[PDB]
Amino acid sequence: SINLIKSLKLYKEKIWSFDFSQGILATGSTDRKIKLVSVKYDDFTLIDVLDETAHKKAIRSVAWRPHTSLLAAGSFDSTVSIWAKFEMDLLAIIEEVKGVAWSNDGYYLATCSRDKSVWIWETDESGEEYECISVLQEHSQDVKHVIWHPSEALLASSSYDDTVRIWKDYDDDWECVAVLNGHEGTVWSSDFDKTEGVFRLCSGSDDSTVRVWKYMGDDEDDQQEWVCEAILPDVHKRQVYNVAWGFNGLIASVGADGVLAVYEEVDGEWKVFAKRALCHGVYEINVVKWLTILATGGDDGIVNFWSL
Ligand SMILES: [Ca+2]
User: Fold this and answer.
1) Cα–Cα distance measured from residue 58 to residue 60, given in angstroms and rounded to the nearest whole number
2) Beta-carbon neighbours within 5 Å of ion ligand 1
3) How far is CA 226 from CA 145, 240, 256, 291, in A?
4) Alpha helices per DSSP H over the chain
5) d(CA 178, CA 213)
6) How far is the centre of ligand 1, averaged over its atoms, from the C-alpha of 163 (Å)?
7) Least C-beta-crowded within 10 Å: which of 69, 120, 128, 270?
8) Which domains does the chain carry?
9) Radius of gyration in angstroms for the set of CA atoms belonging to the chain, rounded to a whole number
10) How far is 71 from 171, CA to CA, in rounded Å?
């Protein structure tokens, strides 16, 4: 069962992105303004609004530098802003951006764009200055999403070209080490398995499916061999706009259809663990995260918080 524990209206426009660190959810909407929410299972409250006309168009992506309170925000502007901190103070502008994501060591910030590229930026302990170390142009269409592995410097990008690409460095020489071919429409997002050891990834698409991909070792050329090992059971009717793979082993998906589903892997097979229809009323749902509880963000400007 998926139970609503709290419903929080934040904007009157779409929520596109959110991210959780250190008990705080950051959110992004068609708005200039970034909103921060304190979250506990008490909880569940507004604490700050980030603006200062930094701030020109829709905030398509927000991400916390992991286990810290520094924040990055990417915009339809083509720009990406940086905040630190109560209150949050601005720090930098880096130069449509569709996604931002940090490596778990906190030193690399990846950005992706309608321009078909993925940029890798490096910073230090302080997060004050950003050096562009790679410009990664292999996708043939709009890149929708970037995410790093929980513990390796491995990056996954998802694109309107129907592929996920995996990127890895050898001494800051970042290159594409696999192209995950199989989805039949735009891949909106992906997330890595949190199981220790060799890698897997799930991805959600316009084609109404969630695929689970499995790494099958390096080839002779130091490229990675990857196959789609499963397609999850039917849920969505059907753009799948976001997926999230929790440390609990469970995958969550959300779609244009207003459904939130959870899947569990037992004895080498996936089953729907739980599902709920009309989670944002009549509204498309764009984003989902495991916080353990679920947060969903929808076209109605609400973040719903659900218990499992
Ligand atoms: Ca399907």
Assistant:
1) 6
2) 208-209, 234
3) 19, 22, 28, 29
4) none
5) 11
6) 17
7) 128
8) 1-308 (2.130.10.10)
9) 18
10) 26
Residue with tokens 């499963």: 230
Q: Are 62 and 26 in contact (CB under 8 A)?
A: yes
Residue that has been written with the tokens 């130069």 in this structure:
95
Give the resolution to one decimal, in Å: 1.7
Q: 210-222: b or e for each residue (b if 16 or more CB lie within 10 Å)?
A: bbbbebeeeeeee
Ligand 1 centroid to Cα of residue 204, in Å, is: 10
Sign (positive or negative) of CA dihedral 290, 168, 198, 159: positive
Query: Sign (positive/negative) of CA torsion 193, 199, 200, 205?
Result: positive
Q: What backbone phi and psi angles, to 5 degrees, belong to 94? A: -115, 140
- Residue 291 Cα to ligand 1 midpoint, Å, equals 26
CA of 9 to the centre of ligand 1 (A): 30
The single residue listed with the structure tokens 């506990």 is: 40
Cα 254 from Cα 60, distance rounded (Å): 17
Q: Which two tokens stand for residue 106?
A: 């906190």
Residue 259 CA to ligand 1 center (angstroms) comes to 13
Specify the experimental method: X-ray
Closest by Cα among 1, 14, 2 to 303: 14
Sign of CA dihedral 292, 296, 302, 307: negative
